[PDB]
Amino acid sequence: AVDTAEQVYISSLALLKMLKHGRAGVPMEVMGLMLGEFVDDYTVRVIDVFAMPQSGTGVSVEAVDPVFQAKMLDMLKQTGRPEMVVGWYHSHPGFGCWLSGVDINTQQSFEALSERAVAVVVDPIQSVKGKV
Amino acid sequence: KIMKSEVLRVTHELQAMKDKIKENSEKIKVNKTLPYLVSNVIELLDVDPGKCAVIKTSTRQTYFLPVIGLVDAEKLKPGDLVGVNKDSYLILETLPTEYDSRVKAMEVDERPTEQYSDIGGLDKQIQELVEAIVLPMNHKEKFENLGIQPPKGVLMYGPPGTGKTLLARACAAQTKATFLKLAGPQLVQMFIGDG
Amino acid sequence: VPGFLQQSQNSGPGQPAVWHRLEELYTKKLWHQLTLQVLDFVQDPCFAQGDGLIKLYENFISEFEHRVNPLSLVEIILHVVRQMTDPNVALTFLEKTREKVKSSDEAVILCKTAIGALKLNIGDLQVTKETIEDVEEMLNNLPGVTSVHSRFYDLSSKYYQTIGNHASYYKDALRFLGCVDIKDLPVSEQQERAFTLGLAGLLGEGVFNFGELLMHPVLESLRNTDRQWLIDTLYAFNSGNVERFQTLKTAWGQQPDLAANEAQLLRKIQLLCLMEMTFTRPANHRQLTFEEIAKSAKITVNEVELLVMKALSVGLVKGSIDEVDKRVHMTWVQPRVLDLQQIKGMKDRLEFWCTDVKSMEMLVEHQAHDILT
Amino acid sequence: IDGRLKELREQLKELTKQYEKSENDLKALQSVGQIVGEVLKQLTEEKFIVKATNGPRYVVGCRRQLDKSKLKPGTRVALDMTTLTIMRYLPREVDPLVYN
Amino acid sequence: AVQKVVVHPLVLLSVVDHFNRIGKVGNQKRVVGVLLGSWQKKVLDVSNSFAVPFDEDDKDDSVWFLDHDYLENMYGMFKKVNARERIVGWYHTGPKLHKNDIAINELMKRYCPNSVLVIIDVKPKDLGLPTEAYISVEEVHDDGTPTSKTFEHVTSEIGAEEAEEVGVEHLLRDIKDTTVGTLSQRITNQVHGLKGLNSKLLDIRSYLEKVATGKLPINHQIIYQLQDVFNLLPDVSLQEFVKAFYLKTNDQMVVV
Amino acid sequence: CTKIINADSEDPKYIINVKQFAKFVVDLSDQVAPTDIEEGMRVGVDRN
Amino acid sequence: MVLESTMVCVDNSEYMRNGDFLPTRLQAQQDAVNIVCHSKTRSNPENNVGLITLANDCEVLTTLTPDTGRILSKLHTVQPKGKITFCTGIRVAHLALKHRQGKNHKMRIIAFVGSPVEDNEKDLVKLAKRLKKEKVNVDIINFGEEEVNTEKLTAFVNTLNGKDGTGSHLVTVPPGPSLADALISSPILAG
Numbered sequence A: 001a002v003d004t005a006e007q008v009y010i011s012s013l014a015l016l017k018m019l020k021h022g023r024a025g026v027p028m029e030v031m032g033l034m035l036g037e038f039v040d041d042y043t044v045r046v047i048d049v050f051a052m053p054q055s056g057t058g059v060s061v062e063a064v065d066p067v068f069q070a071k072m073l074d075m076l077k078q079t080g081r082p083e084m085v086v087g088w089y090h091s092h093p094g095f096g097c098w099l100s101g102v103d104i105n106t107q108q109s110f111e112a113l114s115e116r117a118v119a120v121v122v123d124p125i126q127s128v129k130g131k132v
Numbered sequence B: 001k002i003m004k005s006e007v008l009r010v011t012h013e014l015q016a017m018k019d020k021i022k023e024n025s026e027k028i029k030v031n032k033t034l035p036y037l038v039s040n041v042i043e044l045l046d047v048d049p050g051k052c053a054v055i056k057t058s059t060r061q062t063y064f065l066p067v068i069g070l071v072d073a074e075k076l077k078p079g080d081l082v083g084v085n086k087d088s089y090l091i092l093e094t095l096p097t098e099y100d101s102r103v104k105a106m107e108v109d110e111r112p113t114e115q116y117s118d119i120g121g122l123d124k125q126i127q128e129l130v131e132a133i134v135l136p137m138n139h140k141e142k143f144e145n146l147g148i149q150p151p152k153g154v155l156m157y158g159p160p161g162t163g164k165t166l167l168a169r170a171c172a173a174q175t176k177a178t179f180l181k182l183a184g185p186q187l188v189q190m191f192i193g194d195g
Numbered sequence C: 001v002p003g004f005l006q007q008s009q010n011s012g013p014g015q016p017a018v019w020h021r022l023e024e025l026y027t028k029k030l031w032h033q034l035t036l037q038v039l040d041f042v043q044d045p046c047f048a049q050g051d052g053l054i055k056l057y058e059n060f061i062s063e064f065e066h067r068v069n070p071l072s073l074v075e076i077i078l079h080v081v082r083q084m085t086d087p088n089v090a091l092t093f094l095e096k097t098r099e100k101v102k103s104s105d106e107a108v109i110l111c112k113t114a115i116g117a118l119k120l121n122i123g124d125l126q127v128t129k130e131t132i133e134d135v136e137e138m139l140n141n142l143p144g145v146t147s148v149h150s151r152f153y154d155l156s157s158k159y160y161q162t163i164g165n166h167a168s169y170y171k172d173a174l175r176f177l178g179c180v181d182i183k184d185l186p187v188s189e190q191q192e193r194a195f196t197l198g199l200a201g202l203l204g205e206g207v208f209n210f211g212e213l214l215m216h217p218v219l220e221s222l223r224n225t226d227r228q229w230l231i232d233t234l235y236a237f238n239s240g241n242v243e244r245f246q247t248l249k250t251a252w253g254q255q256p257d258l259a260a261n262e263a264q265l266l267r268k269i270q271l272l273c274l275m276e277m278t279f280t281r282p283a284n285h286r287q288l289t290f291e292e293i294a295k296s297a298k299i300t301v302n303e304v305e306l307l308v309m310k311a312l313s314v315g316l317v318k319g320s321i322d323e324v325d326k327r328v329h330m331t332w333v334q335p336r337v338l339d340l341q342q343i344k345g346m347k348d349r350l351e352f353w354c355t356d357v358k359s360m361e362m363l364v365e366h367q368a369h370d371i372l373t
Numbered sequence D: 001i002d003g004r005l006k007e008l009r010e011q012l013k014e015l016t017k018q019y020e021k022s023e024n025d026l027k028a029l030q031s032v033g034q035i036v037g038e039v040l041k042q043l044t045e046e047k048f049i050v051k052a053t054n055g056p057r058y059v060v061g062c063r064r065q066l067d068k069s070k071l072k073p074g075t076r077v078a079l080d081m082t083t084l085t086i087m088r089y090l091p092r093e094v095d096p097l098v099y100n
Numbered sequence E: 001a002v003q004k005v006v007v008h009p010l011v012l013l014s015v016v017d018h019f020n021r022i023g024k025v026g027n028q029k030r031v032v033g034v035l036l037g038s039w040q041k042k043v044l045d046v047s048n049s050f051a052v053p054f055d056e057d058d059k060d061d062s063v064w065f066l067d068h069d070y071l072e073n074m075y076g077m078f079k080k081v082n083a084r085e086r087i088v089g090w091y092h093t094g095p096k097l098h099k100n101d102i103a104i105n106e107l108m109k110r111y112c113p114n115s116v117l118v119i120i121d122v123k124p125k126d127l128g129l130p131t132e133a134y135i136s137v138e139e140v141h142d143d144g145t146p147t148s149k150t151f152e153h154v155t156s157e158i159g160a161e162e163a164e165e166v167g168v169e170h171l172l173r174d175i176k177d178t179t180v181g182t183l184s185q186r187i188t189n190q191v192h193g194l195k196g197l198n199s200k201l202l203d204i205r206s207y208l209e210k211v212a213t214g215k216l217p218i219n220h221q222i223i224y225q226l227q228d229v230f231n232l233l234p235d236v237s238l239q240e241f242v243k244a245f246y247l248k249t250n251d252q253m254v255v256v
Numbered sequence F: 001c002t003k004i005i006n007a008d009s010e011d012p013k014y015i016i017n018v019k020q021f022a023k024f025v026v027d028l029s030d031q032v033a034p035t036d037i038e039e040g041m042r043v044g045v046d047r048n
Numbered sequence G: 001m002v003l004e005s006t007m008v009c010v011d012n013s014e015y016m017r018n019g020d021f022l023p024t025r026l027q028a029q030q031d032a033v034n035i036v037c038h039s040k041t042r043s044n045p046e047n048n049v050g051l052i053t054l055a056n057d058c059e060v061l062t063t064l065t066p067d068t069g070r071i072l073s074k075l076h077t078v079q080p081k082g083k084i085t086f087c088t089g090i091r092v093a094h095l096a097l098k099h100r101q102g103k104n105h106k107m108r109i110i111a112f113v114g115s116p117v118e119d120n121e122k123d124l125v126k127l128a129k130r131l132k133k134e135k136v137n138v139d140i141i142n143f144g145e146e147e148v149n150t151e152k153l154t155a156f157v158n159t160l161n162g163k164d165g166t167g168s169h170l171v172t173v174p175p176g177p178s179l180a181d182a183l184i185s186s187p188i189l190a191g
């Protein structure tokens, strides 16, 4: 229940993955999870992020396949560098810096799973020239 | 021989690719379970420098999905009421069209139950039209192998009360096929081309 | 098979040891080492006089073991096929070898090359052109096998003495010289090959550069001891040196295949004697007057028109040709060997450009200190 | 000899491979398409006025491969769904569809 | 077989980070993985990268290992999330190329027929080159030359990925690598253009000097064929300036 | 928003004309059995 | 439970397609592979056996996995026309089995040799010393005709099993026919 002026050290390649994934699925509101680790309470660092195809159901916890996520994590461990899951990201063309109801529900599920599981809004269409 | 390795690859490839077909079909089918836009096909046969489609959405817009990216133009002809992707703006799957308000069910009886035994008097005529209509329904393969196409147009002319309606519904019941009744006298509509 | 081994242990001194090795190899079911033994016996210091008998024995062994190495088996038995020396049945022999090994390995393509060689040796009209073209047409997805590549190069180099290919014949002879590096054959015959390639370059028309043979040591050292006038003439064609006396001595030094085309030699040397100016002066002397042309080519005034026309056609000089002053503008788009021993000139010009560029950069920096400092 | 059924297995593999290539083309596309509009005004060589069939007209760019001679004024074209730029030009047709 | 390749400003930093994160325990200096992307119109582009730990021995350069199952699973996941992405080549660090590259190409070309090699200089930033592309051509070294490997460099240019401009502007937001301050920025443009020209032409002069000395093998067969025309092209004649004495000098004086 | 339904397939799918003019087909919500819903009756739809 | 992770490097030399065994020595070695992998699977279906090649290449596609069908399919039609590179083959098998695996998984490299080899005694002794320093556990099985259990192979095995090591034997097979059961009898439960 302690949340100070926390800061996210996000990575440039995570940004590039975000922008590519959003540019691909502009109208599908594609989903993903922000691969970061709580090195301490508030200095959260994310070095990598992945892109996952939103299932036909839409924004659902099962759309992020558990077996597929586990296999992806094992692949990252074998080649690359392992990294924990304490966050998520989502291209949000509809409206701005808030979450829809289903987004809030799945973020509640992510909070129950993880410790924080930060809710990250990244608008793909509003970011055009200078403001992401 | 090579068959062992060949079939070892064959079963795996078939099952895995059918699983991939299932995955793609589900990801498209929940969207096919959420189609929203009517399909006014302004068909342009854009052959890739094969086909293409212009869809008039219910929300008054035009979507030019390339090469009709899920269904075949053979079954999808220029018309309406074929599933369109709400998110992917693509022709999703066919679905039944609309039968012109009145003809959706004007007076269509799903199945008549009147029997041939309760009518009579004109038994020779009724047997003649039975041979001309019901037999082309039950023993249609008989005509098919004979090579003679059965006639279709049968005109029962006679004063009212002679049982044409009952005979027709009984014939339809004997065929066990669909029966559609047309109310002729009210087919004269003021609207242009309405009939 | 034991009876054939017993019979085959005869007919040669030292052969029964190799026949015992063969017996062991088919007892333990060895095919590749058996092909090596067959290679050793065929390349043994003997003429293989019993060519038909050894053909029969080898076919017997290969038909009752039916698992030998195909490409190497054909590479070896082609010697016996050629040695049998009867083309009418040699074609059937090649068909039989194709049927015994019809795989897409070196075997079938070597059989095609043997067919082409037979058609050269006799009947040079039946399938010669189709065979020679189809070798390259079938060398697809085969970048560096190099074996049947050398074979095809040899066939087309020998096809040089046919109407179809002269310059391409020289090109594939060069390809053979590249693909096979060691001498692996007499220096005198390599010198004869160099003579033939030099005559091909001299008689040819499209061979203006004709690279990798002008100053190539592998080709020149063969005739370094005999007919060094040929070496000098090729160096003349390379560097633009005229040496008209030595080149005429070349024209009548090897009389066959040169006396009829000495005129073409004249035209080619007049064509190629200007490239020296062309690369040595980077538009430093861009006034190719009639007197300069006369100094360069020892040619008359009316022939200058035809010479510069052919130069424009081939690609030597593409500039404007005047006649009030007879000035020829200098652009070259067909580079060739620049005598790497004389690379000092281009190195000096490049370092001159470097010095000029750096000096002007420093000068503009001096003028621009008021902003850059 | 199980090897003589290789032909039947080959037929099965070809039959299923036709379906597999069909599904590959079906899923590889997964496209959103392009919106349909008309060249309301060419404006200039760079920017063009393209009006959707149902309201808004926009000042957009043109497809790189296409040219103004292929675009022309008053011709049906396709704009990018999101970035709103010309992607392809299409022919149009009208039909009286009565007593034909 | 491809005409040319174009590298995005999208995979370079990803490769560098992969090198950094997998070199913590692997100090082989040899990072080997695959670059995925798309090839459409004789222009090949790279959109994704992946690194695999990789150990070499100098003994004939034939000692190595990879995680091919994990790499293939990665490729399947990448194609599932984005179908247009495909393995366009394989990349190795260590610009001093060794001899296992042929075996690696032979093994990986089952994913890509025109197998290409990519070298990324993580630590080196020599002038501006982030990476180099390599095409495999073993179809005879030359018309009259012996057999060789001869991996040639297909021309590479840094592309312009979309939607990354916002991110790169926010990231830097300090140098402003744009034409801002037109006069001074173009002065800097002239300055580093002269710097690059001088450095590269000095390198060419050094190569000519070393060919003259003959300490290194001479690839003259393309060197003179490409540099003779460069040298003889008549950009030194000034009579065209005589013909165009007012080349723009009229515009100079109207601007004055 | 609430719109009437048009018709359905054999059982699972429902082809509906919707007051947004929409060619609307949905999986009926898990709490609602297909038996209760009949053609030409008005149902509300959850925008998501 | 003590689980075993085994990496087999298989000799794809130009000779292996000869018919010394009934089908081909190559198919005989493939049968040795699939029977030993069957034994591993019967011990525990999640025991993992991987393939390595040494015919001027190192096949890693068939990784350290329990399934045997991939080994069978990928080793079939291996085109045994190239040479033998023993020093590269066992070393790359070591690197491939050095990859991510359980620490409980006992690392073991098994080699199949069926053809005569022309390599340097000095080079192979250097490799044996390097593997002795690296504490490598490799057992080698021969098949068919060869200088079976040559001096190089014997010294290599002695270096890898001595100094109170596992004690993995190398069998001196008769040329041609051989008894795979007698070849793999000892190391399947002892070594």
Ligand SMILES: Nc1ncnc2c1ncn2[C@@H]1O[C@H](COP(=O)(O)OP(=O)(O)O)[C@@H](O)[C@H]1O
Residues within 6 Å of the ligand: B118, B119, B120, B121, B158, B159, B160, B161, B162, B163, B164, B165, B166
């Ligand atoms: N053969 C018959 N058996 C029983 N009822 C009959 C028969 N013929 C006519 N009807 C009666 O006549 C009515 C149908 O009249 P209608 O169909 O208008 O006659 P028509 O077909 O000659 O115009 C039915 O209600 C039926 O009860």
